[PDB]
């Protein structure tokens, strides 16, 4: 088997599109679903929407632009939903923001999102001659000063460690990614049809195995933006626009016996919370340390 870089991307997107078509071809034929607003602004507000098509974002378009722009994450019953996930049965919806009193749910949803971006930054930035295997997106708590992604690289490429030029280029391509506006999309896949998309990454295939194993229906949660697809835990933030300052700060070589795993550590803030040029240097200092919470 011999594969081109663009071919694999296309194939993944085709698998994903086949998925979508198969999810939509369930023939709901526009069934009426009912949502209620339990939020504190307009209580006793009802929404008659279209089951498994209409979204909690499409529910914000009824209120005002303010909701559309401010709300990162929806709290529907006992679950956070992300804005672009269609809705299943009758629900009750509350909207979450960065300035709310228990933003934590959103915060976890930020790092996850932010981490995923740095995937695109990396895999596509390498020479055709080498090989980049993305491993997992280890979830650190927010008090640790960074977000981290795990990466394995070609064995002959393993001796050199990055230069401030390379780092700055990572940052630059990240911000260039933020520049064009990318929506985030959520799909529910079976382990059988999920294991076919990732393939060549063994760590993806095994992570999928464990993750889908712990939950009885063998369900994998996929997140697609642009040409990139990634499996993660929990919901993501609605648009790429929301991320303002992006930095790829440090990269650290960690070595196990059977694997050489590099951490990519970075820092980012939302356009809502954006911080001053002095503070940014202070936090960009703390993101240089090797930050370990895996378990």
């Amino acid at each position: 088997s011999q594969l081109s870089p663009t071919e694999l991307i296309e194939m993944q997107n085709d698998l994903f599109n086949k998925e979508k078509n198969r999810q939509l071809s369930l023939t709901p034929r526009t069934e009426k679903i009912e949502v209620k607003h339990v939020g504190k602004t307009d209580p006793g507000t009802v929404f008659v929407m279209n089951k498994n098509i209409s979204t909690p974002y499409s529910c914000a378009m009824h209120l005002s632009e303010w909701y559309c722009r401010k709300s990162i994450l929806a709290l529907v019953d006992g679950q956070p939903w992300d804005m672009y996930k269609p809705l299943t049965k009758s629900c009750e919806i509350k909207f979450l923001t960065f300035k709310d009193d228990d933003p934590g749910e959103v915060n976890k949803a930020y790092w996850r999102s932010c981490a995923m971006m740095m995937g695109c930054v990396i895999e596509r930035a390498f020479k055709d001659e080498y090989v980049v295997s993305l491993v997992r997106a280890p979830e650190v708590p927010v008090i640790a000063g960074a977000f981290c992604y795990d990466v394995v690289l070609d064995k002959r490429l393993d001796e050199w460690m990055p230069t401030k030029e390379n780092l700055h280029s990572f940052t630059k391509d990240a911000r260039a990614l933020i520049y064009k506006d990318l929506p985030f999309e959520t799909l529910e896949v079976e382990a059988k049809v999920a294991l076919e998309i990732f393939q060549h990454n063994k760590y993806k295939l095994d992570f999928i195995e464990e993750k889908a194993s712990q939950n009885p229906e063998r369900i994998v949660k996929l997140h697609r933006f642009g040409d990139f697809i990634d499996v993660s835990e929990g919901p993501l933030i609605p648009r790429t626009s929301i991320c303002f300052q992006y930095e790829v700060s440090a990269v650290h070589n960690l070595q196990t016996q059977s694997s050489l795993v590099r951490r990519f550590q970075g820092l980012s803030l939302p356009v809502h919370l954006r911080a001053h040029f002095t503070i940014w240097n202070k936090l960009l200092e703390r993101s240089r340390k090797m930050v370990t919470e895996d378990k």
Binding site: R124, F126, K127, D128, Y130, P162, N166, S169
Partner: protein, 108 residues
């Protein structure tokens, strides 16, 4: 061998008079530029934009050029570039671009 103008540029010229006298015939073949007068084509290219670590980032750092300046400084750079005064470079009123011809007559 007499010619009023040198044969060293444009055309070599020959003025003859018809035997009868009623016609001036004029023979002017083109002068090809001699090879000894030319210089070799300048060919200068250096691509060092490439980093040895990653070539996709090395050819993604070729589209990394951009800036935005103020109206005034921009105008001074444009007029320096084309060797113009700085007045030509300013916008035009509504009234003027309303009345610019939509379809200018094209010849040949």
């Amino acid at each position: 061998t007499y010619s009023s103008l040198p044969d060293d540029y444009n055309c070599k010229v020959e003025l003859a008079l018809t035997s009868d006298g009623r016609t001036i015939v004029c023979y002017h073949p083109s002068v090809d530029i001699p090879y000894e007068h030319t210089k070799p084509i300048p060919x200068x290219x250096x691509x060092x934009x490439x980093x040895x670590x990653x070539x996709x980032x090395x050819x993604x750092x070729x589209x990394x050029x951009x800036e935005h300046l103020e109206q005034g400084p921009m105008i001074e750079q444009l007029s320096k570039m084309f060797f113009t005064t700085k007045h030509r470079w300013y916008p035009r009123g509504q009234y003027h671009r309303r009345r610019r011809k939509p379809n200018p007559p094209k010849d040949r």
